[PDB]
Amino acid sequence: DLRLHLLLNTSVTCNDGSPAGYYLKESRGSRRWLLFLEGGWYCFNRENCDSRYDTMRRLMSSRDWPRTRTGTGILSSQPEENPYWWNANMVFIPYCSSDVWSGASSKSEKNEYAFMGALIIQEVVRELLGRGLSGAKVLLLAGSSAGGTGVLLNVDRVAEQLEKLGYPAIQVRGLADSGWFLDNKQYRTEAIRRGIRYWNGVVPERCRRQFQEGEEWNCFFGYKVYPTLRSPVFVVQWLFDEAQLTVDNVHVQEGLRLYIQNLGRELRHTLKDVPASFAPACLSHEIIIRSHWTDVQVKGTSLPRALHCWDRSLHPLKGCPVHLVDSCPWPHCNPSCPT
Ligand SMILES: *[C@@H]1O[C@H](CO)[C@@H](O)[C@H](O)[C@H]1NC(C)=O
Ligand SMILES: COCC(=O)NCc1ccccc1
Numbered sequence: 001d002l003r004l005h006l007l008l009n010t011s012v013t014c015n016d017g018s019p020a021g022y023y024l025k026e027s028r029g030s031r032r033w034l035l036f037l038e039g040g041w042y043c044f045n046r047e048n049c050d051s052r053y054d055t056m057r058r059l060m061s062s063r064d065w066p067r068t069r070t071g072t073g074i075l076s077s078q079p080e081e082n083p084y085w086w087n088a089n090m091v092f093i094p095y096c097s098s099d100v101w102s103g104a105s106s107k108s109e110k111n112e113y114a115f116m117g118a119l120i121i122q123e124v125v126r127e128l129l130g131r132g133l134s135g136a137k138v139l140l141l142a143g144s145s146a147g148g149t150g151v152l153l154n155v156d157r158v159a160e161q162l163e164k165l166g167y168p169a170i171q172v173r174g175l176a177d178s179g180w181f182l183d184n185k186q187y188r189t190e191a192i193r194r195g196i197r198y199w200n201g202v203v204p205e206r207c208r209r210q211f212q213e214g215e216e217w218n219c220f221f222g223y224k225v226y227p228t229l230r231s232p233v234f235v236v237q238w239l240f241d242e243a244q245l246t247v248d249n250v251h252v253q254e255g256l257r258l259y260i261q262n263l264g265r266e267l268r269h270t271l272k273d274v275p276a277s278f279a280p281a282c283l284s285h286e287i288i289i290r291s292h293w294t295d296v297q298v299k300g301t302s303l304p305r306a307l308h309c310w311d312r313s314l315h316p317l318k319g320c321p322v323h324l325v326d327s328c329p330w331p332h333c334n335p336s337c338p339t
Contacts, residue, residue, distance in 0.1 A: 001025065001068045002075070002092055005127075011106070012123040014096035015049070015060035015113040020120045023069045023092040024131070025077065031137040032088040035124065036075055036289065038095035039145030039178075044195035049098060049113055060096055060113075073289035074142065081291060084304040085140075089132065093124055100192075100220065101143075101150030103199035115199035121154050122161055129165070138171045144286045145243065148179020148236075152222055155231045156204050173314070174233040175307070177288045180222035181244055182266060187259050188249040193217045204228060223270040234276040234310050234322075236303065239264040240331045242285040261329050271325050276310050278303050281326035282337035297336045298324035 002023035010019050040059045043049035053060050075090050076082040095117075097103055103115030121141075125133070133139070141158055143151045155174035162170050183189050195201060196216055203219035206228040211218045219225045226233065240260065245251075250259065264281065271277050280298050287293050287303065294304055301309075301321055309320035326334055 002071055002090055004065060004067050004069075006062065007120075007123055008127060009123055012116055012119050013107065013114045014062050015098055015115070016053070016063075017107045017114060018062045020096060020116070020123070021062055021065070021094065022124050022128075023094070024128075025071060025090040026132060027077070027087055027089045028132075030087050030089055031135055032085060033091065033128070033133055033136045033139045034074065034085055034088045035091045035093060035139065035141050037093055037101055037121075037141070037143030037147030037150045039143065039147040039286070040095050041098075042100050042146060042191075042195060043098045044191050044198055046112060052098065058094075058096075060098060062094070062096060065094065072291050073287075073293045075289055076291075081294070082304070083294065084307045089136075091124070091128070093120070095147060099195065099199040099201060100146045100153070102153050102196065102201035102203065102220075104202050105200035115201070117150065118154060118157070118202045121150075121158065125158055125161060129167075133170075134167065136170050138173065140173050140175055142175035142177065142288060143179065144177040144288055145179060148176040149181075149220060149222075150179070151176040152179065152225050152229070152233070153203060153219070155233060156206075156229055159231050171314075172231050174229075174231055175236070175288065176222070176233060177236040178238065178241060178243070178286045180235055180237040180267075180270075181241075181247075182223070182263070182270070183221055184248065184263070184266065186247070186249050187256065189217060192220050226274065232276065232314060234278070234307065235271065235274050236278045236287060237267065237271070238284045238287075239267050239279055239281045239326060240283045242283060245283075260331070264329055268325055268327070274323070276313075276322045277325060278306050279325040280337060281328050281331065281334045283331040284338045287338075292338070295336060296334075296338065298326055298334070
């Protein structure tokens, strides 16, 4: 069980002005810290944010949050469920900003909602230094779906924050799960372009300088922002991601068969020069905080093992690979896929 702490700085808020927060489970014999970013789509104007407030309010407010959460998957403390980092300090950061963790805008007389995702991450890091993070050797910023994209947008800013605060010894790294999307043609970019304006959204400096004003939406797409990042980032992405297919209007004849095969081929291509990655040929979405995340394998290697091999590489390894991308071209050609 991780225990809830609401942020002491009450100016850093969820969408409706209630305080943001984090769930923490300490491990005093450990200098590793795992900070996980929750996902859950987004909203990009007044009317669709109002709708989300009616029926997805826990993703916009802390007023109804429970006092504890069970750590599952990579956030579990039992070695049988989490062979990778079972002894680490565990942090779950709830997603209540609806902005893919990019916003820096307060609620005010001109703004009905606050979009403070990028500031929530910074404030969590600041307050955790007083609870033990000051002694860390590794800070792994992880996240799933919109939280996975959030890792790509924020990992270098976290590294810069700790440098300027006087902690150059803490190594900051990223783990982006199911947040690596393609801006491809549908089967039958605009919402993010509107979102960034609505949220006062922020993207990494080197990527923003390449694409410049009005084109910062490009930095939300993994294959475009990843080459600009300096921190080490491990990328987990199903080749046939269900959220990718949703936005592509895919719900089997030749036309659709070729569409699906070309989508897997394009995703595989964008990962060819990503040295730390895990990309199985499955139709699914998210994995790292699922209890059965130990089950899937690529070329005979599990995801917890690949992450362990990544740790060793950051001290090629014999029988310990870190780049694992399926080559077979159809969903569930890998027998280990989630049932
Ligand atoms: C609280 O957070 C806001 C927004 O990031 C910041 O401007 C302010 O300085 C913070 N206050 C303190 C006391 O850290
Ligand atoms: C589709 O997955 C749900 C989600 O939250 N996507 C965030 C995102 C939107 C646009 C570009 C990149 C990332």
